[PDB]
Design a protein around this ligand. Structure first.
Ligand SMILES: *[C@@H]1O[C@H](CO[C@@H]2O[C@@H](C)[C@@H](O)[C@@H](O)[C@@H]2O)[C@@H](O[C@@H]2O[C@H](CO)[C@@H](O)[C@H](O)[C@H]2NC(C)=O)[C@H](O)[C@H]1NC(C)=O
Ligand SMILES: *[C@@H]1O[C@H](CO)[C@@H](O[C@@H]2O[C@H](CO)[C@@H](O)[C@H](O)[C@H]2NC(C)=O)[C@H](O)[C@H]1NC(C)=O
Ligand SMILES: *[C@@H]1O[C@H](CO)[C@@H](O[C@@H]2O[C@H](CO)[C@@H](O)[C@H](O)[C@H]2NC(C)=O)[C@H](O)[C@H]1NC(C)=O
Ligand SMILES: [Zn+2]
Ligand SMILES: [Zn+2]
Length: 442
């Protein structure tokens, strides 16, 4: 009973009848949006060190060395509890050309490495500014719209709400974020950013981007043990933004770090009803944090029967843990008046480390897969990802395809049996935390 239950009131405006978007006309323009998340840069990464140490994070000087030099940390990363060297990140931005030009970029937190015990505020800012300047160097004019992750501050997950004031607050972090991201965000967005770490703006006509600070929903944010009731009034603020976009007829993309399924109950539950209320206004939801390729389907609140939205959970750039580095690109309905702004398809690129770390190897980022093609989907709409889940329940060969891509082409040695399957398939339907009914049909 540590966390209380609370409610958020929706405006008196009646909900318009549900009208799921219609597919775009033949040959309509399509925009490409890059999605980066969980870069996790370890400035202490050292090739050849022991990648299987006893500490939380290995592949460092303090991690020691292995007796067999063959078993030492690789040049571009390692398949272990290790984060990325600056090389692989800078190499990621270098090879973006083949991933087509981008209209926008979404960047969703987890920038520092997992060296929690020895991390200072100065170290965190050094990561923020270093990798921000690098991303802006390679993308140039293309704007990047970032979001706050759970590793940005110190201690990890410590994001006090606004009512906690003074030096103990996270104003040292939001202030630096406003300075670092000023080239990318307008003034009104920076104003909100400096306060609660979230903001809203219009990247293009008819679209409204909302970047949420999901640390106010995290079970790990120890600060929320004081008061977990809509910290920073973010959910209430979200309702006002969504309702205002409904009035203007705009569409909304929401971005964040922790997907709403991994949130505290009340936050996740209140979030669930806001989605359902503004299903016509929402055009996309993009999160990260999980480091793995996934998605979460939303249903109508009362009966949990009609799927009405999907949140795409892109995979990490980092290897943590035993993963190939990869990134994501979304194909979205283009920039024209009659656009729905929805996700039409998406692609995933990786860097096969076994080939990049091999003697004489070279890092070449390649497309791992394209969703619709490999899952045989007529589109990327909620109903279509709903069918895919219950399809993977019936046959095994298709789930193994999903399970393989899950791990960015590098799944573990132990196979995923029938108890692992239901757990995985059930998570794809659990966009609302602590809701066992959502998996009744599994
Ligand atoms: C936690 O605080 C809420 C109200 O304030 C919250 O924090 C603000 C800084 C801002 O983020 C708001 O959006 C938040 O809601 C308390 O809610 C009160 O609840 C009583 C009855 O329980 C109600 O009569 C009051 O009107 C509420 N206050 C407001 C401002 O609406 C809540 O009680 C606090 N939690 C605990 C355990 O005390
Ligand atoms: C605000 O709080 C932070 C967190 O404790 C302080 O950070 C430390 O500051 C001292 C200098 O007084 C340094 O020696 C430590 O290395 C800092 N630690 C970390 C983790 O950053 C900071 O000093 C405080 N600021 C003020 C003005 O009191
Ligand atoms: C990453 O690269 C490795 C090495 O090229 C791939 O492993 C090889 O896979 C082929 C068939 O796919 C086998 O015949 C070789 O014996 C494998 N070599 C080694 C050293 O294991 C691996 O499939 C690649 N993975 C991805 C996702 O591209
Ligand atoms: Zn992470
Ligand atoms: Zn995270």
């Amino acid at each position: 009973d540590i966390f209380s239950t609370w409610n958020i009131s929706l405006p008196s405006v009646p909900k318009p009848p549900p009208k799921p978007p219609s597919p775009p006309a033949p040959g309509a323009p399509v925009s490409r949006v890059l999605f980066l998340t969980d870069l996790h840069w370890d400035h202490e990464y050292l090739e050849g060190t022991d990648p299987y140490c006893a500490d939380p994070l290995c592949c460092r000087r303090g991690s020691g060395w292995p007796p067999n030099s063959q078993k030492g940390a690789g040049f571009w990363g390692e398949y272990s509890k290790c984060d990325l060297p600056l090389r692989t990140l800078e190499s990621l931005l270098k090879g973006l050309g083949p991933a087509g030009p981008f209209e926008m970029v979404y960047w969703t937190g987890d920038i520092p490495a997992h060296d929690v015990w020895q991390q200072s505020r100065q170290d965190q800012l050094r990561a923020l500014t270093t990798i921000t300047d690098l991303v802006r160097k390679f993308l140039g004019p293309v704007p990047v719209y970032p979001a706050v992750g759970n590793h940005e501050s110190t201690p990890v997950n410590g994001f006090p709400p606004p009512f906690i004031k003074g030096n103990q607050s996270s104003q040292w972090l939001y202030e630096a974020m406003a300075k670092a991201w000023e080239p990318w965000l307008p003034a009104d967005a920076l104003h909100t950013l400096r306060i609660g770490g979230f903001y809203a703006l219009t990247p293009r006509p008819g679209l409204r981007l909302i970047s949420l600070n999901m640390n106010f929903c995290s079970r790990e944010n120890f600060w929320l043990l004081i008061n977990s009731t809509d910290p920073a009034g973010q959910l209430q603020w979200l309702v006002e933004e969504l309702q205002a976009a409904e009035n203007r007829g705009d569409k909304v993309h929401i971005i964040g770090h922790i997907p709403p399924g991994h949130c505290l109950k009340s936050w996740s539950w209140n979030y669930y009803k806001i989605i359902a209320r503004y299903e016509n206004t929402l055009a996309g939801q993009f999160f990260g944090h999980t480091h793995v390729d996934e998605f979460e389907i939303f249903y109508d609140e009362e009966t949990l029967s009609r799927p009405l939205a999907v949140a795409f959970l892109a995979p990490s750039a980092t290897t943590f843990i035993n993963l190939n580095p990869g990134y994501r690109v979304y194909q979205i309905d283009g920039n024209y008046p009659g656009s729905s702004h929805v996700v039409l398809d998406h692609e995933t690129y990786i860097l096969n480390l076994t080939q990049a770390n091999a003697a004489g190897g070279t890092p070449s980022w390649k497309r791992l897969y394209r969703a619709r093609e490999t899952y045989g989907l007529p589109d990327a709409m909620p109903a279509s990802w709903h069918n895919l889940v219950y399809r993977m329940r019936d046959d095994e060969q298709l789930f193994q395809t999903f399970w393989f891509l899950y791990h960015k082409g590098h799944p573990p040695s132990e196979p995923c049996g029938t108890p692992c399957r239901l757990a995985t398939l059930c998570a794809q339907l659990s966009a609302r935390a602590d809701s066992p009914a959502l998996c009744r049909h599994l």
